[PDB]
Design a protein around this ligand. Structure first.
Ligand SMILES: Cc1cc2nc3c(=O)[nH]c(=O)nc-3n(C[C@H](O)[C@H](O)[C@H](O)COP(=O)(O)OP(=O)(O)OC[C@H]3O[C@@H](n4cnc5c(N)ncnc54)[C@H](O)[C@@H]3O)c2cc1C
Ligand SMILES: Cc1nc2c(=O)[nH]c(=O)nc-2n(C[C@H](O)[C@H](O)[C@H](O)CO)c1C
Ligand code: SF4
Ligand SMILES: [Cl-]
Ligand code: NA
Ligand code: NA
Ligand code: NA
Ligand code: NA
Ligand code: NA
Ligand code: NA
Length: 516
């Protein structure tokens, strides 16, 4: 018989600056819980379970130190309840609450579950997470349903609205909006010798792993005794500072680069802030502001391309995919424009493929819970696009295996940008590529069993023929765009014999897809 108000904090709601905490109330109880149900909607990476569980406990500790009343329920405690609604209802009854409040969730499934909660004698309210730049209530106007809103136009509007990288008279700093064309370098040997050591934390996780195991919770991937990912706001801020000082000067330059050689190949110059942002340990405003401040203080050593390249991903892509998700869900999750139905190959779960590119991206995903963007898009994403993998199966892999994956951001990037299964709603054109793209941006083909210079026959890079088979299959859909039509000239110039050898090689590789 003890609290008037119960307030839930979900595992991705770790915003230390939330207005709830701006006052101290002895009549308010905060609840944060490890939840079996949140392990059952997809099979998560063990490192993702460890990171969220560690971060939820660390946030509870922060709140308690600040004088808030907080109960953190680990799986041993939460297993007494049937699901999250039962946990809420029983605890509200236990403490004789008059009111229950929660922060709006960031997946459709959970927003719907909480919206349908009814508690006898208890008033329920839903508040914002106080994190994203675009207010949730503006999504319907900014993102009309089933409309292919152009990310670039939304990004320019966001640049003007928030003032980031804008001139005093309202123009983009540097004479253009988007510096992506300057951000397409491959790492050469001297660049590899200069790669910085990624900032890795030492967060022990043996007890968390043992608790997960005791509850027979399924997971994918691997972890040792220590988790390298930030699990509290101080570690996240330290990663942000590391990024600004050590990585931001080359972030754009090598944004699309991949290497099989260097020990730090899994991180390169990326920020690795996505988990910290998506769990709301950091806000996008503070990350943007920190990186712009570092740029301005570097007196030319951080070029504008680096910081615009970074800001575009947070102010532009991240806010954009959120808007498109909420405007188009739940129908969006049914879209399969290209009719893709192939099973995801088994080496997505173990890395046992002879394609060096796929082997590197899958193995790092399994071993780190993380792949950088060009791997997600142009290595595993392109492969799943060209081989027509079932989007439901692809979504389950991406949403589970990456520590930063929550559906609002996974689904538009995977089903939309990578698989083109929304017919271009999210990103306009398919991101299809042959092995020539991988060879241009990476050193993978120099350490591969296949020959990237061969399109057909024995030992040819499978991407080379799978690319043409895909583009020819969809020629009528895609030839209306004029720039891609050029690609069909490269094809139409080939002999009948060569065209046929390529399509025959593609079909053979698909029939043997488990062996690639
Ligand atoms: C198929 C596919 C699936 C993806 N699934 C996810 C996912 O589940 N969660 C996720 O956060 N990102 C996802 N991304 C986007 C992007 O690849 C990751 O944000 C990025 O790899 C995270 O690494 P980082 O923090 O080092 O990013 P950096 O390269 O340092 O980029 C800076 C920040 O920009 C943001 N960002 C970059 N690209 C995007 C994007 N396309 N959409 C949204 N935010 C972006 C993130 O906040 C990131 O921390 C996906 C991309 C693809 C192509
Ligand atoms: C692995 C995981 N575990 C939990 C948990 O046990 N409890 C919790 O409150 N949240 C967890 N999360 C985050 C949620 O599954 C879900 O993705 C977000 O709350 C959506 O906004 C995740 C991702
Ligand atoms: S040759 Fe083809 S399969 Fe091998 S690394 Fe290059 S792109 Fe990947
Ligand atoms: Cl070189
Ligand atoms: Na359940
Ligand atoms: Na306390
Ligand atoms: Na070279
Ligand atoms: Na991106
Ligand atoms: Na779903
Ligand atoms: Na685009």
């Amino acid at each position: 018989m003890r609290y008037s108000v119960v307030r839930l904090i979900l595992g991705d709601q770790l915003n230390h600056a939330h207005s709830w905490f701006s006052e101290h109330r002895d009549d308010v109880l905060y609840l944060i819980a490890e939840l079996h149900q949140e392990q059952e909607y997809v099979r998560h990476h063990i490192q993702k379970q460890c990171a969220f569980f560690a971060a939820m406990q660390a946030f509870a500790d922060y709140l308690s130190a600040e004088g808030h009343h907080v109960w953190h329920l680990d799986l041993d405690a939460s297993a007494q309840y049937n699901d999250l609604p039962d946990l809420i209802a029983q605890i509200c009854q236990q403490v004789q609450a008059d009111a229950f409040q929660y922060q709006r969730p960031d997946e459709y499934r959970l927003l719907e579950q909480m919206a349908n909660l009814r508690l006898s004698g208890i008033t329920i309210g839903c508040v914002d997470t106080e994190h994203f730049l675009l207010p949730f209530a503006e999504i319907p106007e900014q993102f009309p349903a089933s409309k292919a809103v152009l990310m670039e136009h939304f990004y320019r509007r966001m640049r003007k609205r928030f003032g980031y990288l804008m001139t005093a008279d309202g123009k983009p700093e540097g004479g253009q909006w988007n510096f992506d064309a300057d951000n397409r370098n491959k790492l050469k040997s001297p660049d590899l010798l200069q790669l910085p050591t990624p900032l890795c934390f030492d967060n022990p996780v043996a007890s968390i792993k043992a608790r997960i195991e005791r509850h027979r919770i399924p997971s994918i991937g691997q972890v040792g005794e220590s988790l390298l990912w930030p699990i509290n706001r101080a570690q996240a801020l330290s990663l942000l500072a590391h990024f600004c000082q050590i990585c931001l000067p080359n972030f754009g330059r090598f944004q699309d680069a991949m290497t099989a050689q260097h020990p730090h190949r899994w991180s390169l110059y990326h920020s690795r802030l996505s988990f910290a942002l998506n769990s709301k340990l950091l806000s996008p405003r503070e990350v943007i502001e920190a990186t712009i401040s570092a740029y301005r203080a570097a007196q030319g050593q951080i070029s504008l391309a680096q910081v615009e390249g970074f800001v575009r991903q947070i102010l532009g892509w991240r806010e954009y995919v959120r808007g498109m998700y909420w405007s188009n869900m739940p129908h969006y999750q049914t879209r399969n424009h290209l009719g893709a139905q192939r099973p995801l190959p088994s080496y997505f779960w173990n890395g046992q493929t002879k394609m060096r590119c796929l082997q590197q991206a899958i193995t790092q995903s399994l071993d780190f819970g993380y792949a950088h963007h060009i791997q997600r898009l142009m290595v595993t994403g392109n492969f799943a696009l060209l081989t027509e993998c079932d989007p439901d199966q692809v979504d389950a892999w991406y949403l589970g295996i990456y520590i930063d994956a929550i559906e609002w951001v996974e689904l538009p990037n995977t089903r939309g940008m990578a698989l083109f299964a929304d017919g271009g709603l999210i990103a306009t054109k398919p991101y299809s590529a042959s092995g020539s793209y991988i060879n241009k941006m990476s050193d993978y083909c120099a350490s591969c069993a296949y020959q990237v210079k061969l399109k057909s026959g024995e030992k040819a890079c499978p991407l080379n023929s799978l690319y043409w088979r895909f583009m020819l299959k969809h020629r009528d859909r895609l030839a209306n765009n004029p720039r891609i039509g050029m690609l069909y000239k490269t094809w139409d110039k080939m002999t009948s014999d060569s065209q046929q050898a390529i399509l025959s090689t593609a079909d053979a590789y698909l029939s043997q897809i488990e062996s690639l």
